[PDB]
């Protein structure tokens, strides 16, 4: 009836032309209004193969989130070893909005509703939709923010878990609030999180993790090395780049409920769209603040003989960030 195929998806968002948010401006030019009533047809007695790691929908969501950044967050000067660029650098309003990815005629999207699918393999309870759920293009590292949350229990997703060179996406199932603020070292900011809520998460997952290993103890430690983007929970909030220090989130002793993360606001950043540095104008005046929901984690397991298996926060290609939401989906040609 259908085959795995590739083509040109299209995006859909509930974006008003009234708004000045940069994300909205981009959507109004490249997305169509969300179909109001979506008709999804579960398919009885069917099983379909899925590989989140070979999914070309990601490749497209990548291109698009680059697109927004290209217009949404223009750097004053961006440096590569081929090219130097200096240009207009305005500050813009900035709030990520969900994005849906629909299929044109001749094609449809298949979704895996199994609450525990790892992302590579067949799926018993498969449905069919004309458009993904709405995914907020959050760019972040170590911690996955504002995503979807696992329906029932924690899910560990990797291509080859024995390969210590492959990202480990973790989809939590109980979110954890995080509040990051720069108030009005003077580019210093901070985040607050509930130790108890975070530790509870760290355990539910450290428990889930030994399930994939034989009678091995689990440990959490800070990153082994890398650019500040990797070695910190890095992100943008209000067009400002926070780099926050998760040494108090990745530890085998989890402190009091409220724990405080030192952050710093950077004008120079190593780019994820490309290999280079982008320089940005200093932070705007004001109380820049961002309450976020941690929905998943990115991690890496130390290799080499160990009696403990250690995991460390890992930034990765952003695509992984898209993978975390586009795991459930595939593209079929009728």
């Amino acid at each position: 009836v259908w085959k795995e195929a590739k083509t040109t998806l299209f995006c859909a968002s509930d974006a008003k032309a009234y708004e000045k948010e940069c994300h909205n401006v981009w959507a109004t030019h490249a997305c169509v209004p969300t179909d109001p009533n979506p008709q999804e047809v579960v398919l009885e007695n069917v099983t379909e193969n899925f590989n989140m790691w070979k999914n070309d929908m990601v490749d497209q969501m990548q291109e698009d989130v680059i697109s927004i950044w290209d217009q949404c967050l223009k750097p004053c000067v961006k440096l590569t070893n081929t090219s130097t660029l200096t240009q207009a650098c305005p500050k813009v309003t900035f709030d990520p909005i969900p994005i849906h990815y629909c299929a044109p005629a001749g094609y449809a999207i298949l979704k895996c509703n199994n609450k525990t699918f790892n992302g590579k393999g067949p799926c018993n309870n498969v449905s069919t939709v004309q458009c993904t759920h709405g995914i907020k293009p959050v760019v972040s590292t170590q911690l996955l923010l504002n995503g979807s949350l696992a329906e029932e229990e924690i899910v560990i997703r990797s291509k080859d878990l024995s390969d210590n060179a492959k990202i480990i996406i973790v989809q939590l199932n109980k979110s954890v609030e995080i509040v990051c603020t720069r108030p009005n070292d003077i580019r210093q900011a901070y985040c607050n999180i509930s130790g108890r809520n975070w530790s509870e998460a760290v355990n539910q997952v450290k428990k889930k993790l030994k399930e994939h290993f034989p009678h091995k103890n689990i440990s959490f430690q800070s990153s082994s090395g890398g650019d500040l983007e990797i070695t910190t929970h890095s992100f943008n909030c209000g067009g400002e780049f926070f780099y926050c220090n998760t040494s108090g989130l990745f530890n085998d002793t989890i402190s009091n409920a409220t724990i405080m993360l030192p952050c710093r606001i950077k004008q120079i950043i190593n780019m994820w769209q490309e290999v280079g540095k982008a320089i940005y104008a200093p932070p705007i005046k004001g109380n820049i603040t961002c309450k976020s929901d941690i929905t998943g984690l990115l991690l890496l397991r130390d290799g080499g003989d160990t009696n403990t298996e250690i995991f460390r926060p890992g930034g990765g290609d952003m695509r992984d960030n898209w993978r975390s939401e586009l795991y459930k989906y595939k593209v079929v040609e009728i």
Partner: antibody
Amino acid sequence: QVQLVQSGAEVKKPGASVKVSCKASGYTFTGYYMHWVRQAPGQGLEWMGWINPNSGGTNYAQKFQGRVTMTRDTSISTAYMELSRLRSDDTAVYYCARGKYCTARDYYNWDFQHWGQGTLVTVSS
Amino acid sequence: EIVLTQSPATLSLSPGERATLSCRASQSVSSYLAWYQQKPGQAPRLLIYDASNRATGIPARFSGSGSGTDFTLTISSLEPEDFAVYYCQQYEFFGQGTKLEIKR
């Protein structure tokens, strides 16, 4: 004409640190992980870790943590390995090695198709 | 996390003979294995990648087989240049080596 070239043999005393260089040519340096592996005289191979040159991300073998540091300089296609607090039994030939496939291919990356010439060390009083 | 055992420790043959080398993975579930040849004072050379594919520049007399826990490297007819030490590798893990010798 893919080439990997390492710094020359170095001899250091016990308790010191060392930094070995590995200059790459013939490919996109950020496209491939560089691993490090050593070899004691007459002995087998012992993997030490890998680095991602696009990001600087690392993975280290548990056997040595805080005794070893891996780095990169993308401007000169050079990878570095630093091993601190040396023991006499760290005396060995050190090789850097590239996976066959580009990180973007996401396939099995641990086929070491390209090797450096090796760097001979000597931890000695 | 995984251990590689190759056997025998030493292989002694003559040119023209068939060579068979074994690598046994301990408790492993992967199907990926690479083979390396090393001559003294030289860098290792990748002979076979992904278990059963011949590396570029490697002669047709080399073959790989196996899946699972037991894997094999075959050389149809030993040539003078083929006697060396042989390693298997999976992920970050190396076997202890096999010495392939001229028997006399």
